């Protein structure tokens, strides 16, 4: 009872938690620093999916996202933009094949990136992101083992 009642309390100034990557200096290629998440249902060819999230970076940038199955989808994608203040993102794209992974291409970026409230909605509205709130951890978010950075969750920096 007590746990449930606590969970229902709205409180905008309670500590929020977000995904945080300290990227450091820019690398040479897009693919030199990648962050991965897998939709809980494989994306289907011909269906349009909408990536929603809020994002903040230490410098204004484009954030490239390539969906991936047996082939990579370079266009159209849910790639988006970030600024130094939290902004909301909503980007739709039609899958052109069966896609099982979203690749965040962070290689050419420098500094810091924070993300939160990540959703991926199929045409009916089903959310295919298992862990988009980061209030416990960043389970489900991975990287190549040889990419030397840490995937963390932290208190929202702008609170
Ligand atoms: Ca959160």
TrEMBL record:
Coiled coil: none
Binding site for Ca(2+): 17, 116, 133, 135
Keyword Metal-binding among record annotations: yes
Keyword Hydrolase: yes
Protein keywords: Calcium, Carbohydrate metabolism, Glycosidase, Hydrolase, Metal-binding, Polysaccharide degradation, Repeat, Signal, Xylan degradation
A GO molecular-function descriptor: metal ion binding
Biological processes annotated in GO: xylan catabolic process
Family per similarity comment: Belongs to the glycosyl hydrolase 10 (cellulase F) family.
Protein name per Swiss-Prot or TrEMBL: Beta-xylanase
Species name: Segatella baroniae B14
Residues of the full protein shown: 136 to 294 of 560
